[PDB]
Amino acid sequence: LRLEKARKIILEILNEKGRDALYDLSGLSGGFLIDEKDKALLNTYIGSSYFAEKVNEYGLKHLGGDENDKCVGFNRTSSAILATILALKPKKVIHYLPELPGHPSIERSCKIVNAKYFESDKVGEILNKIDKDTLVIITGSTMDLKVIELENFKKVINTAKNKEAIVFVDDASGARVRLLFNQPPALKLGADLVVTSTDKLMEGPRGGLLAGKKELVDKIYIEGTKFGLEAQPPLLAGIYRALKNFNLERIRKAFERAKNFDLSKIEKLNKELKAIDDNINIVYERTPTGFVIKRVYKDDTINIKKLIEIGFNLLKNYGIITITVAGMPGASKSLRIDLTSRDAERIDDNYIIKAIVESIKMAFKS
Amino acid sequence: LRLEKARKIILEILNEKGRDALYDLSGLSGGFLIDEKDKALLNTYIGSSYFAEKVNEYGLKHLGGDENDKCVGFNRTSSAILATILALKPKKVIHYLPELPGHPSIERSCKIVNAKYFESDKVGEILNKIDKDTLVIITGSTMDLKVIELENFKKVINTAKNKEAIVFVDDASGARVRLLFNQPPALKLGADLVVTSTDKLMEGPRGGLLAGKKELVDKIYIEGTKFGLEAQPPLLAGIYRALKNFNLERIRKAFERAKNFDLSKIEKLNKELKAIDDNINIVYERTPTGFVIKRVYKDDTINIKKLIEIGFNLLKNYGIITITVAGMPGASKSLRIDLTSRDAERIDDNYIIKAIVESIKMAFKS
């Protein structure tokens, strides 16, 4: 599955030093944070009921559910969406979202149940299509930090209420993102159902949480279990630890860290290395979650080569894992540092910037 | 989710002594056996590709695949079955199995794709229904240790070959069970596809492995990923460790242990306790995988109560986990010891029999 040199060195580091010497700053990492107590519980039959109970508990808390609500774990968010559509068998699904290519899981699930599908990021195109035979789905946010406007959110919910239509909020990232923007949880807004992802601004694995009216959640969960769409206990355990450790303030501090991150040594290095070679041109950009180094060299072919070499230098010498350590483009290619990553808590700004400076310098030896 | 007293005491034992003091002999336990190296890998992005590769490797080995084959992980076996049926879109599915209520996942998957479904444990009823528009599924075995006759297996495969029909073997338990009976792996028999469960006579979690022709496995896997039916990396890691540690001889030795297990102290205790109370009547039966104590008292209401009390005694004093520790009937009720359980390797016959004898005695204090 393309280039295993990155795997090898991580294993060298793990053997010679240990897990604490590795830092995945790529942002795209699942968070499996179970302890030996969990591990022991996972090797008993009472482990399945135990973690399902903790997920219900910390999941309801996270999603603003009340005593009439239940929260269950699915293998992925797409799994919860398919289970919902298979259980409810809507004749039509109306999908309101921030930007107008959506994720295809809802549409694909519709195809399977021969339900009609319609999507739009325009509230006016949503409102007049809502009737009793429609399942209304609202994607709350993007990872890009675009959100559905709160008044629009409330208008859609109000219309479904009037038409006796079920409202199912896709808060895959929105259960975190919208809250950063001071919006209430989906269930507090009157949503019948909500789904969120346990690895989007959370320290859990990829997985889904589905919450809402007990009756609805139960039916959907039973449907899901027919085909193994539900989260198994090892996944429920990782989800529980994510939920238990989750705190919104942590996310706000990570975003602030990125905002205040001193990147001037990069510019200093850029002008410094032109002594070696006039074709060196370090281009970087600050990002909502950290920063990206897009370029280090003017000639496009050497640029690619050098970025990969720097990524390898970062890993080898500093234990920092990034995407450029995997060969060639397709996914990213830019050297990306995501400060919202759990591992970024283990290292200060000084470690990161010095690691980057030295890793670049190393690749541009005369 | 009914009675959490069993959870509490296990947590007391874990805190006061540790994981090694717990023994789940119920047989129905998933096996999550990952080490800190795995755990560290699961908290990086290279963890997903790494464990997928190990599963392909140790899965192909386990299932008798060749260089043209691939092996992938699904969340459950039902997940692989749905993915297969969604990808291949057969017009009809023919399901040959050992005994004639089958598991409903295939039929349910058929309903979703509007495919016709037919099942039979009679080979003659299978052969004449096979044509080009049929997906032929063979369930290889039951956990009851019934298997499809080898010549019948070969006849079905031969007919599908003649009719250009795909053969998909449900070796959920059969990938182990049939081998105990000296049958070749499904892929060696000419099956196009095979699915097996990673917790049936294996020390993995519940999950599925799907293996066969690369082209077929790829298509099905891509279909599965649309709805999160594929095994996530934490599940792939547990599967890998199961596969890595698997050895057929271990299973044969566990079965031999059950065959040779001295249960005479139970009978000795039975006759001994009639001094206390003439209504005491310990009824036990040897089992292919261990033994079951069905009864301890003649009056049916006290019987129930005492069996639960004994189960609690077993847990409290000896760390042995069984089903009777969960209150009332519905599931099991009989005190069951499964010697194929991983935890049974940590204790000798003497520990188990003395634990049972003393736990019964304790419940029948005057």
XYZ file of C-alpha atoms in Angstrom:
732
model
C 0.000 0.000 0.000
C 2.778 2.425 -1.080
C 6.041 3.164 0.815
C 6.630 1.335 4.104
C 9.870 3.150 4.992
C 7.797 5.461 7.239
C 6.429 2.410 9.074
C 9.944 0.990 9.595
C 11.474 4.065 11.239
C 8.482 4.576 13.594
C 9.049 0.956 14.695
C 12.769 1.666 15.165
C 11.848 4.710 17.319
C 9.273 2.669 19.294
C 11.860 -0.050 20.008
C 14.803 2.234 20.791
C 12.983 4.997 22.694
C 9.205 4.427 23.007
C 5.727 5.789 22.211
C 6.426 9.153 23.897
C 9.101 9.849 21.272
C 6.508 9.825 18.485
C 4.425 12.876 17.609
C 1.744 12.608 14.937
C 1.060 16.219 14.032
C -0.682 15.313 10.739
C -4.121 15.881 12.285
C -5.640 12.881 10.459
C -4.987 10.371 13.268
C -7.509 8.286 15.205
C -7.178 8.359 18.993
C -7.163 4.997 20.725
C -6.643 5.867 24.382
C -7.666 2.780 26.372
C -6.005 1.762 29.655
C -5.290 -1.699 31.127
C -8.554 -1.588 33.105
C -10.435 -1.219 29.774
C -8.263 -3.864 28.127
C -9.046 -6.307 30.955
C -12.783 -5.494 30.668
C -12.620 -6.044 26.891
C -11.460 -9.603 27.547
C -14.629 -10.461 29.487
C -18.278 -10.804 28.362
C -19.383 -7.947 30.660
C -17.182 -5.652 28.543
C -19.820 -5.161 25.836
C -22.548 -3.935 28.213
C -20.086 -1.881 30.307
C -18.713 0.288 27.486
C -22.132 0.642 25.816
C -23.322 2.070 29.151
C -20.376 4.498 29.467
C -20.871 5.648 25.860
C -24.582 6.221 26.486
C -23.663 8.220 29.608
C -20.783 10.390 28.329
C -22.396 10.596 24.862
C -25.693 11.944 26.164
C -23.709 14.494 28.224
C -21.680 15.562 25.163
C -24.740 15.821 22.883
C -27.086 17.644 25.289
C -29.543 14.728 25.579
C -32.202 14.430 28.291
C -33.655 11.489 30.283
C -35.822 10.415 27.312
C -32.776 10.061 25.098
C -30.238 7.298 24.383
C -26.772 7.458 22.790
C -25.267 4.491 20.921
C -22.017 3.763 19.078
C -21.745 2.982 15.363
C -18.684 1.814 13.435
C -18.587 5.108 11.498
C -20.961 8.028 10.931
C -21.809 6.626 7.486
C -22.840 3.441 9.357
C -25.308 5.390 11.543
C -26.671 7.205 8.488
C -27.285 3.906 6.603
C -28.859 2.304 9.708
C -31.191 5.306 10.163
C -32.292 5.277 6.515
C -32.753 1.461 6.553
C -34.834 1.673 9.762
C -36.993 4.720 8.995
C -37.447 3.908 5.301
C -38.237 7.514 4.332
C -39.779 8.042 0.882
C -37.630 11.157 0.492
C -34.562 12.659 2.167
C -33.906 16.401 2.231
C -30.286 17.329 3.056
C -29.390 20.870 4.136
C -25.654 21.598 4.370
C -23.070 24.459 4.446
C -21.468 23.844 1.002
C -22.857 22.132 -2.101
C -20.966 19.062 -2.756
C -22.047 16.976 0.271
C -20.616 13.701 1.569
C -22.116 10.859 -0.519
C -23.172 8.439 2.292
C -26.743 9.814 2.637
C -27.401 9.775 -1.136
C -25.934 6.253 -1.403
C -28.124 5.048 1.471
C -31.134 6.585 -0.297
C -30.318 4.668 -3.486
C -30.451 1.415 -1.518
C -33.954 2.134 -0.064
C -35.220 3.700 -3.312
C -35.746 7.000 -1.479
C -35.525 10.264 -3.397
C -32.628 12.525 -2.403
C -32.193 16.299 -2.632
C -29.440 18.551 -1.301
C -28.936 22.324 -1.109
C -27.044 24.895 0.955
C -29.948 27.323 0.420
C -32.540 27.286 3.237
C -35.357 28.423 0.881
C -34.787 25.354 -1.283
C -35.065 23.162 1.827
C -38.177 24.640 3.509
C -40.656 24.148 0.647
C -39.673 20.486 0.128
C -40.364 19.385 3.727
C -43.492 17.240 4.206
C -44.616 14.189 6.246
C -42.836 11.753 3.927
C -39.463 13.512 4.220
C -36.540 12.784 6.499
C -34.802 16.127 6.970
C -31.025 15.936 7.474
C -28.982 19.002 8.467
C -25.173 18.872 8.225
C -24.265 21.304 11.033
C -20.759 22.243 9.926
C -17.682 21.508 7.850
C -14.146 20.837 9.185
C -13.448 24.052 7.262
C -15.379 25.672 10.150
C -18.372 26.785 8.060
C -21.624 26.374 10.013
C -25.358 26.459 9.243
C -26.683 29.868 10.390
C -28.528 29.480 13.710
C -31.748 31.164 12.543
C -31.767 28.978 9.391
C -31.197 25.933 11.619
C -34.227 26.937 13.714
C -36.362 27.693 10.612
C -35.745 24.225 9.149
C -36.552 22.605 12.531
C -39.710 24.713 12.903
C -40.964 23.675 9.457
C -40.367 19.964 10.091
C -42.276 20.383 13.361
C -45.197 21.866 11.413
C -45.046 19.137 8.767
C -44.450 16.239 11.215
C -41.094 15.452 9.663
C -38.194 13.842 11.549
C -35.085 16.028 11.920
C -31.742 14.196 11.888
C -28.680 16.422 12.483
C -25.371 15.340 10.913
C -23.086 16.889 13.536
C -20.097 14.762 12.412
C -17.896 17.793 13.191
C -20.690 20.221 14.196
C -21.188 18.801 17.696
C -17.824 20.457 18.363
C -17.590 23.139 15.648
C -20.999 24.828 16.141
C -20.364 24.969 19.902
C -17.142 26.896 19.223
C -19.491 29.360 17.522
C -21.794 29.433 20.598
C -24.676 27.393 19.133
C -26.699 24.949 21.246
C -26.335 21.163 20.830
C -28.590 19.688 18.118
C -30.850 17.887 20.630
C -31.355 21.151 22.545
C -32.458 22.746 19.256
C -35.209 20.147 18.954
C -33.526 17.616 16.651
C -35.050 14.152 16.888
C -31.691 12.540 16.148
C -28.042 13.546 16.010
C -24.902 11.781 14.720
C -21.320 12.891 15.410
C -17.835 11.562 14.692
C -15.567 10.577 17.555
C -12.338 11.668 15.828
C -13.282 15.158 14.596
C -11.968 17.617 17.193
C -12.026 14.658 19.579
C -9.396 12.131 20.745
C -11.297 8.999 19.832
C -11.109 6.584 16.941
C -13.124 7.037 13.767
C -16.643 6.013 14.730
C -20.113 7.425 15.083
C -22.353 8.326 17.973
C -26.080 8.333 17.332
C -28.309 10.004 19.918
C -31.922 11.085 20.348
C -35.345 9.784 21.332
C -34.933 6.345 22.958
C -37.621 4.800 20.733
C -35.882 6.060 17.541
C -32.341 5.206 18.621
C -33.471 1.663 19.649
C -35.100 0.900 16.283
C -32.116 2.208 14.330
C -29.659 0.322 16.565
C -31.545 -2.949 16.133
C -31.564 -2.381 12.349
C -27.798 -1.659 12.414
C -26.998 -4.818 14.397
C -28.468 -6.954 11.588
C -25.389 -6.095 9.472
C -22.702 -5.258 12.079
C -22.954 -1.477 11.612
C -22.859 -0.952 15.394
C -19.558 -0.199 17.174
C -17.932 -3.281 18.708
C -16.780 -3.049 22.369
C -13.122 -2.229 21.583
C -14.391 0.736 19.561
C -16.893 1.658 22.308
C -14.004 1.697 24.836
C -11.909 4.130 22.752
C -15.029 6.281 22.219
C -15.709 6.318 25.980
C -12.155 7.529 26.778
C -12.433 10.224 24.087
C -15.738 11.381 25.572
C -14.513 11.166 29.169
C -11.422 13.259 28.376
C -13.136 15.712 26.025
C -13.206 19.379 26.976
C -14.214 22.205 24.622
C -11.625 24.567 26.154
C -8.785 22.278 25.008
C -9.911 22.851 21.403
C -10.108 26.613 21.926
C -6.557 26.625 23.364
C -5.218 24.576 20.429
C -6.765 27.074 18.009
C -5.215 29.929 20.033
C -1.823 28.196 19.981
C -1.955 28.127 16.173
C -2.958 31.821 16.051
C -0.026 32.842 18.280
C 2.581 30.359 16.905
C 5.822 32.178 16.037
C 6.804 31.165 12.489
C 9.462 33.872 11.903
C 12.408 31.436 12.195
C 11.130 29.860 8.948
C 11.502 33.231 7.147
C 14.865 33.731 8.876
C 15.971 30.314 7.584
C 14.660 31.065 4.087
C 16.828 34.173 3.677
C 19.747 32.387 5.370
C 19.747 29.405 2.945
C 19.873 31.592 -0.187
C 23.612 31.752 0.613
C 23.761 28.029 -0.221
C 21.502 28.072 -3.304
C 19.432 30.903 -4.825
C 16.712 28.419 -5.917
C 15.665 27.715 -2.306
C 12.295 29.364 -1.585
C 10.460 28.371 1.590
C 6.764 29.195 1.290
C 4.614 28.686 4.388
C 1.090 29.645 5.452
C -0.550 29.917 8.868
C -3.667 27.805 9.177
C -6.672 27.716 11.557
C -5.175 24.564 13.170
C -1.453 25.236 12.688
C 0.607 25.819 9.589
C 1.640 24.362 6.264
C 4.955 24.542 4.429
C 3.874 24.449 0.804
C 7.258 24.853 -0.873
C 11.034 24.848 -0.217
C 12.456 25.003 -3.750
C 11.666 26.833 -6.982
C 12.114 23.890 -9.392
C 8.988 21.750 -9.006
C 10.670 18.323 -9.245
C 13.318 18.988 -6.569
C 10.664 20.712 -4.425
C 8.776 17.379 -4.199
C 11.961 15.429 -3.420
C 13.120 17.888 -0.747
C 9.715 18.027 1.032
C 9.738 14.222 1.373
C 13.357 14.318 2.625
C 12.450 17.000 5.218
C 9.470 14.906 6.360
C 11.840 11.965 6.819
C 14.303 14.208 8.683
C 11.424 15.348 10.918
C 10.544 11.733 11.734
C 14.118 10.405 12.101
C 15.556 13.152 14.270
C 12.525 14.529 16.074
C 9.835 11.809 15.940
C 7.405 14.171 14.196
C 5.004 12.355 11.871
C 3.597 14.304 8.893
C 2.151 13.379 5.468
C 5.256 14.162 3.341
C 6.863 11.019 4.793
C 4.599 9.087 2.399
C 5.990 9.379 -1.139
C 4.672 11.694 -3.904
C 1.415 13.775 -4.140
C -2.260 12.699 -4.271
C -2.873 13.287 -0.574
C -1.543 16.608 0.812
C 2.172 16.716 -0.235
C 2.543 19.984 1.706
C 4.285 19.628 5.059
C 1.384 20.139 7.489
C 1.418 20.671 11.254
C -1.913 20.366 13.074
C -1.692 21.767 16.610
C -5.094 20.295 17.586
C -3.440 16.832 17.534
C -3.168 15.137 20.931
C 0.598 14.686 20.474
C 1.156 18.434 20.116
C 0.308 18.668 23.861
C 3.526 16.702 24.574
C 5.829 19.268 22.889
C 6.239 23.047 23.103
C 6.370 25.573 20.257
C 10.180 25.617 20.547
C 10.542 21.872 19.878
C 8.340 22.073 16.778
C 9.904 25.153 15.188
C 13.486 23.967 15.876
C 12.620 20.522 14.483
C 11.313 22.153 11.307
C 14.255 24.570 10.957
C 16.858 21.812 11.483
C 15.049 19.308 9.217
C 14.984 21.840 6.359
C 18.657 22.837 6.930
C 19.674 19.156 6.851
C 18.042 18.649 3.435
C 19.947 21.637 2.011
C 23.520 20.661 2.879
C 25.982 21.781 0.197
C -28.981 -3.251 30.816
C -29.863 -5.656 33.681
C -27.767 -6.334 36.832
C -24.470 -4.463 37.201
C -23.369 -6.229 40.402
C -21.223 -8.539 38.224
C -19.509 -5.484 36.714
C -18.795 -4.017 40.175
C -17.026 -7.056 41.638
C -14.849 -7.576 38.515
C -13.759 -3.937 38.974
C -13.058 -4.598 42.667
C -10.928 -7.628 41.652
C -9.134 -5.596 38.941
C -8.299 -2.839 41.450
C -7.314 -5.079 44.365
C -5.491 -7.842 42.465
C -5.412 -7.313 38.669
C -6.399 -8.725 35.261
C -4.635 -12.061 35.894
C -7.086 -12.755 38.730
C -10.024 -12.793 36.309
C -10.987 -15.877 34.317
C -13.818 -15.671 31.798
C -14.720 -19.299 31.210
C -18.121 -18.451 29.660
C -16.778 -19.042 26.140
C -18.728 -16.082 24.701
C -15.914 -13.532 25.155
C -14.157 -11.456 22.499
C -10.355 -11.483 22.602
C -8.665 -8.102 22.475
C -4.974 -8.925 22.784
C -3.085 -5.829 21.609
C 0.280 -4.754 23.058
C 1.750 -1.269 23.645
C 3.531 -1.396 20.269
C 0.097 -1.824 18.596
C -1.447 0.828 20.834
C 1.299 3.292 19.854
C 0.797 2.432 16.151
C -2.969 2.942 16.535
C -2.286 6.521 17.614
C -0.550 7.364 14.325
C -1.896 7.650 10.746
C 0.365 4.806 9.536
C -1.589 2.515 11.886
C -4.443 1.962 9.422
C -2.220 0.730 6.570
C 0.042 -1.271 8.924
C -2.665 -3.454 10.488
C -4.533 -3.867 7.179
C -1.260 -5.272 5.807
C -0.739 -7.662 8.755
C -4.354 -8.858 8.491
C -3.945 -9.467 4.756
C -0.751 -11.421 5.508
C -1.829 -13.571 8.483
C -5.384 -13.834 7.085
C -4.266 -15.207 3.730
C -2.061 -17.710 5.615
C -4.981 -18.788 7.836
C -7.438 -19.108 4.922
C -5.156 -20.932 2.456
C -5.049 -18.042 -0.047
C -2.504 -17.745 -2.866
C -0.638 -14.799 -4.470
C -3.747 -13.785 -6.466
C -5.778 -13.419 -3.296
C -6.372 -10.634 -0.751
C -7.752 -10.771 2.807
C -9.562 -7.808 4.388
C -11.215 -7.061 7.734
C -14.916 -6.319 8.220
C -16.670 -5.136 11.379
C -18.559 -8.451 11.629
C -19.234 -11.405 9.326
C -22.739 -10.051 8.671
C -20.971 -6.857 7.494
C -18.915 -8.811 4.921
C -22.024 -10.676 3.764
C -23.981 -7.406 3.228
C -20.995 -5.788 1.453
C -20.646 -8.812 -0.869
C -24.354 -8.837 -1.748
C -24.388 -5.027 -2.254
C -21.307 -5.227 -4.521
C -22.167 -8.308 -6.596
C -25.890 -7.543 -6.836
C -26.862 -11.169 -7.526
C -30.393 -11.752 -8.852
C -30.616 -14.846 -6.650
C -28.742 -16.293 -3.670
C -28.595 -20.026 -2.978
C -27.543 -20.902 0.596
C -26.370 -24.420 1.464
C -25.903 -25.102 5.187
C -25.638 -27.930 7.794
C -28.987 -27.335 9.593
C -32.188 -25.674 8.375
C -32.764 -22.589 10.267
C -29.833 -20.482 8.983
C -28.490 -17.177 10.296
C -30.697 -14.376 8.894
C -27.984 -11.938 7.644
C -27.837 -13.351 4.073
C -31.643 -13.361 3.643
C -31.863 -9.826 5.085
C -29.140 -8.615 2.712
C -31.067 -10.207 -0.169
C -34.225 -8.316 0.816
C -32.306 -5.043 0.529
C -31.056 -5.788 -3.047
C -34.356 -7.404 -4.097
C -32.520 -10.689 -4.696
C -34.382 -13.971 -4.324
C -33.189 -16.187 -1.467
C -33.347 -19.958 -0.977
C -31.827 -22.162 1.716
C -31.560 -25.926 2.249
C -29.356 -28.452 4.042
C -30.036 -30.921 1.203
C -27.380 -30.882 -1.554
C -29.887 -32.079 -4.212
C -32.049 -29.028 -3.547
C -28.987 -26.805 -4.035
C -27.478 -28.301 -7.227
C -30.489 -27.870 -9.534
C -30.991 -24.203 -8.562
C -27.453 -23.069 -9.481
C -27.189 -20.957 -12.656
C -25.256 -17.896 -13.934
C -27.492 -15.466 -12.046
C -26.977 -17.181 -8.676
C -24.536 -16.394 -5.904
C -23.921 -19.711 -4.160
C -23.194 -19.469 -0.423
C -22.044 -22.499 1.590
C -22.059 -22.326 5.405
C -19.173 -24.716 6.170
C -20.056 -25.627 9.746
C -21.952 -24.878 12.934
C -20.416 -24.151 16.376
C -22.255 -27.378 17.224
C -19.469 -28.989 15.141
C -21.721 -30.161 12.292
C -19.973 -29.766 8.923
C -20.964 -29.904 5.244
C -19.858 -33.315 3.890
C -16.660 -32.913 1.845
C -17.998 -34.647 -1.281
C -21.171 -32.496 -1.134
C -18.949 -29.420 -0.733
C -17.028 -30.436 -3.872
C -20.244 -31.253 -5.808
C -21.707 -27.794 -5.143
C -18.399 -26.146 -6.170
C -18.193 -28.287 -9.321
C -21.720 -27.302 -10.377
C -21.095 -23.578 -9.860
C -17.940 -23.983 -11.958
C -20.043 -25.522 -14.740
C -22.707 -22.821 -14.460
C -20.262 -19.889 -14.045
C -21.619 -19.079 -10.610
C -19.581 -17.415 -7.847
C -18.999 -19.559 -4.742
C -18.852 -17.689 -1.424
C -18.048 -19.871 1.622
C -19.430 -18.768 5.007
C -16.656 -20.260 7.147
C -17.624 -18.111 10.174
C -16.678 -21.107 12.358
C -15.814 -23.556 9.536
C -12.367 -22.103 8.812
C -11.480 -23.712 12.149
C -14.144 -26.421 12.575
C -13.836 -28.145 9.162
C -10.042 -28.236 9.571
C -10.505 -30.132 12.849
C -12.314 -32.642 10.634
C -9.381 -32.709 8.152
C -11.041 -30.719 5.341
C -9.082 -28.276 3.166
C -9.519 -24.491 3.513
C -12.379 -23.073 1.408
C -10.029 -21.271 -1.018
C -8.109 -24.519 -1.601
C -11.439 -26.164 -2.487
C -11.937 -23.601 -5.243
C -14.165 -21.076 -3.453
C -14.060 -17.628 -5.027
C -14.616 -15.985 -1.647
C -14.523 -16.949 2.014
C -15.644 -15.161 5.206
C -14.726 -16.221 8.752
C -15.250 -14.860 12.259
C -12.267 -13.816 14.340
C -13.785 -14.888 17.679
C -15.030 -18.402 16.850
C -12.330 -20.816 18.032
C -9.986 -17.832 17.798
C -8.695 -15.261 20.325
C -9.757 -12.162 18.447
C -12.660 -9.777 18.782
C -15.944 -10.289 16.967
C -15.206 -9.297 13.385
C -15.045 -10.745 9.916
C -12.284 -11.641 7.516
C -13.148 -11.699 3.835
C -10.680 -13.367 1.473
C -10.455 -14.485 -2.147
C -9.694 -13.214 -5.638
C -8.087 -9.753 -5.362
C -10.487 -8.264 -7.928
C -13.554 -9.539 -5.987
C -12.273 -8.632 -2.526
C -11.357 -5.091 -3.756
C -14.824 -4.385 -5.188
C -16.578 -5.679 -2.077
C -14.223 -3.740 0.220
C -14.806 -0.496 -1.674
C -18.577 -1.107 -1.458
C -18.278 -1.783 2.305
C -16.288 1.407 2.949
C -19.205 3.495 1.627
C -21.122 2.648 4.837
C -18.349 1.871 7.372
C -18.785 -1.917 7.190
C -14.999 -2.398 7.063
C -13.015 -3.092 10.259
C -11.422 0.025 11.755
C -7.697 -0.152 12.688
C -8.252 -0.938 16.395
C -10.311 -3.939 15.284
C -7.709 -4.860 12.631
C -5.012 -4.838 15.363
C -6.937 -7.269 17.606
C -7.631 -9.462 14.549
C -3.918 -9.465 13.644
C -2.893 -10.625 17.157
C -5.564 -13.353 17.072
C -4.267 -14.532 13.696
C -0.605 -14.263 14.700
C -1.187 -16.328 17.856
C -3.607 -18.827 16.314
C -2.618 -22.483 16.228
C -4.995 -25.348 15.395
C -3.283 -27.661 17.913
C -4.283 -25.353 20.791
C -7.942 -25.979 19.890
C -7.387 -29.737 19.704
C -5.739 -29.691 23.162
C -8.613 -27.658 24.653
C -11.092 -30.201 23.282
C -8.944 -33.015 24.739
C -8.813 -31.243 28.109
C -12.622 -31.218 28.205
C -12.761 -34.924 27.252
C -10.348 -35.886 30.056
C -11.593 -33.388 32.713
C -12.244 -35.178 36.020
C -15.738 -34.193 37.203
C -16.132 -36.874 39.921
C -15.692 -34.401 42.817
C -19.028 -32.877 41.719
C -20.764 -36.263 42.237
C -18.830 -36.704 45.494
C -20.094 -33.288 46.638
C -23.654 -34.094 45.549
C -23.897 -37.180 47.772
C -22.053 -35.341 50.563
C -24.508 -32.386 50.676
C -27.601 -34.607 51.014
C -26.577 -34.713 54.700
C -27.444 -30.998 54.857
C -30.656 -31.103 52.789
C -32.265 -33.974 50.846
C -33.547 -31.535 48.168
C -30.014 -30.804 46.899
C -29.477 -32.484 43.510
C -26.431 -31.477 41.476
C -26.942 -32.348 37.815
C -23.985 -31.830 35.477
C -23.123 -32.819 31.906
C -19.809 -33.072 30.066
C -19.712 -30.994 26.913
C -17.518 -30.914 23.770
C -15.855 -27.727 25.131
C -16.105 -28.360 28.883
C -19.068 -28.953 31.133
C -22.342 -27.521 32.347
C -23.972 -27.683 35.768
C -27.657 -27.642 34.906
C -29.123 -28.025 38.389
C -28.241 -27.968 42.118
C -31.681 -28.146 43.752
C -34.933 -30.020 43.178
C -37.345 -27.100 43.738
C -37.173 -24.992 40.571
C -37.351 -21.549 42.226
C -34.513 -22.153 44.716
C -32.513 -23.884 41.957
C -32.440 -20.571 40.022
C -31.494 -18.575 43.132
C -28.727 -20.990 44.156
C -27.154 -21.150 40.652
C -26.858 -17.341 40.611
C -25.390 -17.380 44.150
C -22.824 -20.044 43.118
C -21.888 -17.972 40.052
C -21.322 -14.999 42.356
C -19.287 -17.192 44.728
C -17.216 -18.341 41.732
C -16.497 -14.728 40.765
C -15.932 -13.353 44.295
C -13.649 -16.059 45.631
C -12.013 -17.452 42.512
C -12.341 -14.766 39.805
C -14.200 -17.175 37.511
C -16.685 -15.413 35.234
C -19.720 -17.412 34.031
C -23.235 -16.542 32.783
C -25.163 -17.312 36.019
C -23.654 -14.135 37.501
C -26.202 -12.256 35.363
C -29.647 -12.571 36.967
C -32.459 -14.932 35.844
C -32.865 -17.054 32.630
C -33.229 -16.023 28.958
C -29.569 -16.578 28.131
C -28.067 -19.867 29.412
C -28.887 -19.943 33.184
C -26.889 -23.184 33.474
C -23.442 -22.770 35.007
C -21.185 -23.288 31.971
C -17.418 -23.778 31.784
C -15.805 -23.492 28.347
C -12.246 -24.850 28.370
C -11.493 -23.409 24.900
C -11.487 -19.927 26.515
C -8.100 -18.191 26.563
C -8.335 -17.700 30.345
C -8.615 -21.446 30.965
C -4.925 -21.648 29.896
C -4.044 -19.636 33.043
C -5.556 -22.194 35.472
C -5.274 -25.964 35.910
C -8.077 -28.520 36.240
C -7.559 -28.516 40.026
C -8.248 -24.775 40.386
C -11.473 -25.037 38.376
C -12.930 -28.116 40.068
C -12.041 -26.879 43.589
C -13.524 -23.461 42.770
C -16.754 -25.142 41.674
C -16.898 -27.528 44.658
C -16.250 -24.734 47.194
C -18.650 -22.277 45.498
C -21.476 -24.840 45.632
C -20.674 -25.788 49.275
C -20.735 -22.096 50.254
C -24.249 -21.647 48.825
C -25.521 -24.627 50.846
C -24.451 -23.600 54.348
C -26.968 -24.720 56.980
